[PDB]
DNA sequence: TAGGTAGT
């Protein structure tokens, strides 16, 4: 009991009763996402919505609406009620431009060379014991310090080249807008923007003059793609992707971002005290501690054996063998090539010894296992990092028919691994600089796991059988494909990576049917769990009841959201809890402060029976056990959904869909 | 080339 439970602070703060609406008002369009007024849309022939206040004149902008009914907040469903409290706070109390001025005062900016780093507030609203809590969090944005108008050297013809690039409006660093149009100067429109900074953002006239300087009224007026309002380059700043930054700058900026969960909690509590709408103390929540379940490998004599971590999996010098080897690859000698960077060709003698030792040790396992061996006699080849197509130009000219492997030794890519696969060649690249500095073979061991997962080998499985016959990871996103499912068995072992062809938007009922009809996987009289990032439409509900009755299967679905607003004020890991019907899942440890996973909308369809399930200790354990099924060298999100995400991203990167290998669970796309 | 770290 003592070792099983821990109480920790979460980023939830009770909203004061003065700011909670007692009545909601229903309306419908008598004459798009009208989120501006803080509503909740329920579509029909004429769209219908709810507001956290009454619109006395049934019109505002000109859209003419019609009154339906009035209901008390306590009577409406918590999910909607929470969204209406946020809307009331956003639209009536204007929390958004207030949270902006609070953060600037707490989290000041950070300047490194030409770039500046700001912070912005994220917020959600959650219902607990009849009260409402504000989930308050903060993130960061990096922009060009020097504003757009001065950046283009006050030249309109130059500014026109920036059309289609991402910018931020200085007082609002959260929203990254896209420039679309650049037109003639309007001093009236500049005074409109200037008044907005004083009226909405509440900035003093001195603050306008301090940050923007002497306002140029002869400035061009520009328009963005995402909103119909005018923009002026003196008030805007260029934004970019974090990865696009020069390594030298990224390392320097790090210090400002990198904060421990406890240290970050201190800033949220600092921000919470200033916000007049909520209470100053964060919410105390009871968390379960997940049991660190063992894994199952094979003994020297091929018997199942328990191992708690994969860090000892390939520490030969006690000896573990693979649990499963696919029908194709079993006891084969693979035609293997070793592609080396021409820059590091002056160190090949040492590079030969590194790979030869690794495979020489791999062979000690490979001889009494029925594992595939590796053949690289005179197959040592050279390539260039900026060379591009030259390496594959010579590779295409080869006669490879059978599945083959390639180890890529460079000097510091996704492009080469994609082009190499087109000749049925599985590849795992290596950066020599890191492999040369391998302390006690840590990388060498992590390599063997990756190359095996790539070769459909199931080395280790779970020491526990789940009640589900199938755990399916689903993701929906150039090949007439719109998504895929990754199917795992009862022991957490990969079975299939199955792409889904669109008939058109891809939904769950169609996916279940495609799997039965076109994918040849038995989904009748079984216990299926679907893990997805998205949410099921109310219209899909009656259709899901139908399919589950017909198949006679227990079909479940749970939403697993990596990007959420929660944060736990602990350095601890392997913990889980529920707040406002949401699973706060924190499986992993991070040397630079972790972020929880949100778990919601757990539905069940048992032979024509829709039922809503509350987030258990059971599934949270199950979902944790799945984060341990890491074949690529644990995971934040469960393995089924993680590998589905990876496959969908590969499709966008124009990767070959080799069905034969996908059918046997070869993770070549990783 | 490992993992995680739409109001101007
Ligand atoms: Mg890899």
Note whether A439 and A538 are same-domain residues.
no
Q: Vertex A519, ends A523 and A653: CA angle to 5°?
A: 125
Mapping DSSP to helix (H, G, I), strand (E, B) and coil, where does residue A207 land? Answer: helix
User: Contact at 8 Å (CB) between A33 and A75?
Assistant: no
Note whether A499 and A648 are same-domain residues.
yes
Q: What's the 3-state SS for A282-331? A: CEEEEEEECCCCCEEEECCCCCEEEECCHHHCCCCCCCCECCECCCCCCC
Looking at A71-217, list the stretches that DSSP marks H as alpha helix, in order from N- to C-terminal side: 78-91, 95-106, 148-151, 156-159, 187-199, 205-211
What is the A408 CA–ligand 1 centroid distance (Å)? 11
| Resolution limit, Å | 2.8
Residues 29-88 of A with CB under 7 A from strand B: 33, 35-36
- Using CA atoms, how far residue A487 sits from A307, A396, A476, A612, A639, in Å, is 24, 33, 15, 23, 10
Measured in degrees and rounded to the nearest 5, phi and psi for residue A559 equal -85, 120
User: Contact at 8 Å (CB) between A575 and A288?
Assistant: yes
Report if CB A407 to strand B is under 7 Å: no
Note whether A485 and A366 are same-domain residues.
no
Q: Is A454 annotated as a binding residue?
A: yes
Experimental determination approach used: X-ray
Report if CB A429 to strand B is under 7 Å: yes
Task: For A558-578, give the DSSP string.
Answer: EEEESS-S--BS-S--SEEEE
Q: State the Cα–Cα distance between residues A645 and A356, nearest whole angstrom.
A: 34
- Using CA atoms, how far residue A452 sits from A43, A398, A435, A492, in Å, is 50, 24, 18, 16
Note whether A440 and A551 are same-domain residues.
no
Report DSSP state, residue A669.
Answer: T
The token pair at A507 is: 């939904």
What is the CA A461 to C1' B1 distance in angstroms?
28
Report if CB A633 to strand B is under 7 Å: yes
What is the A632 CA–ligand 1 centroid distance (Å)? 7
The token pair at A196 is: 């907005």
Measured in degrees and rounded to the nearest 5, phi and psi for residue A144 equal -75, 120
Q: State the Cα–Cα distance between residues A485 and A482, nearest whole angstrom.
A: 11
Residues 548-567 of A with CB under 7 A from strand B: none
Measured in degrees and rounded to the nearest 5, phi and psi for residue A222 equal -120, 155
What is the CA A573 to C1' B4 distance in angstroms?
13
Q: Are strands A494-501 and A527-532 parallel, antiparallel or unpaired?
A: unpaired
What spatial distance separates the first Cα and last Cα of chain A, rounded to whole Å? 40
Report if CB A94 to strand B is under 7 Å: yes
Measuring alpha carbon to C1', the residue closest to nucleotide B6 is: A226
What is the A591 CA–ligand 1 centroid distance (Å)? 22
CATH classification at residue A335? 3.40.50.2300
The token pair at A233 is: 């380059």
| Closest nucleotide to A257 by C1' from CA | B5
What is the A250 CA–ligand 1 centroid distance (Å)? 24
Q: If you compute the radius of gyration of chain A from its CA atoms, what whole number of angstroms results?
A: 28
Domain hosting A627: range is 461-664
| Closest nucleotide to A414 by C1' from CA | B1
Note whether A429 and A539 are same-domain residues.
no
The token pair at A577 is: 């809890």
Looking at A123-216, list the stretches that DSSP marks H as alpha helix, in order from N- to C-terminal side: 148-151, 156-159, 187-199, 205-211
Our CA dihedral for A649, A652, A656, A658, rounded to 10 degrees, sits at: 50
Note whether A600 and A643 are same-domain residues.
yes
The strand pairing partners of A93, in sequence order, are none
Q: Is A670 annotated as a binding residue?
A: yes
Cβ contacts of residue A542 below 8 Å, gap of 6+?
none
Note whether A388 and A478 are same-domain residues.
no
Q: State the Cα–Cα distance between residues A78 and A317, nearest whole angstrom.
A: 58
User: Contact at 8 Å (CB) between A303 and A20?
Assistant: no
The strand pairing partners of A554, in sequence order, are A527, A606
**Beta-carbon count within 10 A of A638 CB:** 27
Report if CB A428 to strand B is under 7 Å: yes
What is the A109 CA–ligand 1 centroid distance (Å)? 37
- Locate breaks in chain A with C to N over 2.5 A; list the residue preceding each: 31, 61, 317, 412, 477, 503, 633
Note whether A378 and A321 are same-domain residues.
yes
**Beta-carbon count within 10 A of A356 CB:** 12
The strand pairing partners of A443, in sequence order, are none
CATH classification at residue A597? 3.30.420.10
Note whether A396 and A342 are same-domain residues.
yes
Report if CB A263 to strand B is under 7 Å: no
Note whether A397 and A495 are same-domain residues.
no
What is the A667 CA–ligand 1 centroid distance (Å)? 10
Note whether A504 and A401 are same-domain residues.
no
Task: For A426-488, give the DSSP string.
Answer: EEEEEEHHHHHT-GGGHHHHHHHHHHHHHTT-B--EESS--S-SEEEEEEE---SEEEEEEEE
Residues 504-543 of A with CB under 7 A from strand B: none
Q: State the Cα–Cα distance between residues A611 and A628, nearest whole angstrom.
A: 29
Report if CB A232 to strand B is under 7 Å: yes
The 10 Å CB-count burial string (b at 16+, else e) for A208-217 is beeebeebbe
Residues of A noted as catalytic: 475, 504, 533, 645
Note whether A466 and A521 are same-domain residues.
yes
Residues 294-313 of A with CB under 7 A from strand B: none
Q: Nearest to residue A352, comparing CAs of A451, A316, A360?
A: A360
Protein contacts on strand B: list nucleotides below 7 Å from a Cβ.
1-8
What is the CA A366 to C1' B4 distance in angstroms?
32
């Amino acid at each position: 009991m003592v070792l099983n439970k821990v109480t920790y602070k979460i980023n939830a703060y009770k909203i004061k009763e003065e700011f909670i609406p007692k009545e909601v008002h229903f309306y419908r369009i008598k004459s798009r996402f009208v989120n501006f007024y803080g509503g909740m849309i329920i579509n029909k022939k004429d769209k219908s919505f709810v507001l956290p206040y009454k619109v006395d004149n049934k019109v505002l902008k000109p859209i003419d609406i019609e009154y339906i009914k009035s209901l008390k907040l306590e009577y409406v469903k918590p999910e909607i009620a929470e969204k209406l409290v946020r809307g009331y706070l956003k639209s009536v109390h204007k929390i958004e431009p207030e949270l902006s001025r609070i953060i600037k005062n707490i989290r000041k900016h950070k300047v490194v060379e030409n770039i500046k780093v700001e912070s912005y507030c994220e917020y959600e609203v959650k219902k607990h014991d009849g009260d409402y809590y504000l989930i308050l969090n903060f993130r960061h944005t990096a922009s060009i310090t020097k504003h757009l108008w001065d950046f283009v050297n006050r030249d309109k013809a130059l500014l026109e080249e920036y059309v289609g690039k991402k910018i931020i409006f200085k007082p609002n660093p959260k929203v990254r807008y896209t420039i679309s149009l650049v037109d003639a100067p309007n001093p009236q429109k500049i005074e409109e923007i200037m008044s907005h900074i004083i009226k909405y953002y509440k900035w003093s006239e001195d603050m306008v003059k301090s940050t923007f300087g002497e306002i140029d009224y002869n400035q061009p007026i520009m328009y963005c793609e995402e909103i119909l309002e005018p923009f002026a380059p003196q008030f805007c700043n260029l934004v970019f992707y974090m990865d696009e930054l020069d390594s030298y700058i990224l390392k320097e900026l790090q210090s400002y971002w990198r904060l421990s969960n406890e240290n970050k909690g201190k800033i949220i509590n600092e921000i919470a005290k200033k916000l007049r709408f909520i209470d100053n103390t964060p919410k105390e929540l009871e968390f379960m501690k997940f049991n660190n379940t063992p894994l199952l490998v094979k003994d020297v004599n091929k018997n199942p054996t328990k191992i708690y971590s994969t860090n000892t999996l390939f520490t030969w010098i006690k000896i573990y063998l693979p649990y499963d080897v696919p029908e194709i690859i079993r006891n084969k000698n693979l035609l293997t090539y070793i592609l080396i960077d021409e820059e590091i060709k002056d160190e090949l003698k040492a590079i030969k010894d590194k790979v030869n030792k690794m495979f020489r040790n791999y062979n000690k396992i490979a001889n009494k296992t029925e594992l595939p061996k590796f053949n690289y006699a005179n197959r040592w080849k050279y390539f260039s990092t900026d060379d591009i197509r030259g390496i594959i130009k010579e590779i295409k000219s080869e006669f490879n028919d059978e599945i083959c492997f390639a180890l890529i030794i460079g000097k510091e890519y996704e492009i080469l691994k994609k082009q190499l696969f087109d000749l049925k060649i599985i590849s795992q690249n290596i950066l020599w600089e890191n492999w040369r500095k391998d302390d006690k073979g840590y990388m060498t061991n992590n390599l063997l796991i990756q190359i095996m997962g790539k070769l459909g080998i199931k080395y280790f499985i779970l020491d526990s059988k789940t009640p589900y016959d199938y755990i399916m990871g689903l993701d929906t996103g150039n090949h007439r494909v719109g998504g895929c499912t990754v199917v795992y068995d009862s022991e957490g072992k990969i079975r299939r990576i199955q792409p889904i062809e669109t008939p058109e938007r891809l939904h769950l009922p169609y996916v279940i049917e495609y799997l039965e009809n076109k994918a040849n996987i038995d989904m009748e009289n079984k216990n299926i769990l679907f893990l997805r990032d998205g949410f099921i439409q109310n219209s899909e509900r009656n259709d899901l009841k139908e399919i589950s009755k017909e198949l006679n299967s227990n079909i479940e679905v749970i939403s697993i959201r990596k990007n959420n607003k929660y944060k736990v004020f602990t350095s601890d890991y392997r913990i889980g809890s529920v707040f406002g019907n949401d699973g706060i899942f924190l499986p992993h440890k991070t040397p630079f402060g972790s972020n929880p996973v949100k778990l919601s909308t757990w539905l069940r369809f048992n032979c024509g029976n829709e039922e809503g399930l509350k987030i258990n200790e059971s599934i949270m354990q199950l979902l944790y056990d799945l984060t341990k099924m890491n074949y690529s060298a644990y995971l934040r999100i469960p393995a089924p959904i993680h590998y589905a995400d990876k496959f969908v991203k590969a499709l966008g990167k124009n990767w070959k869909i080799d069905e034969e290998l996908l059918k046997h669970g070869f993770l070549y796309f990783i």
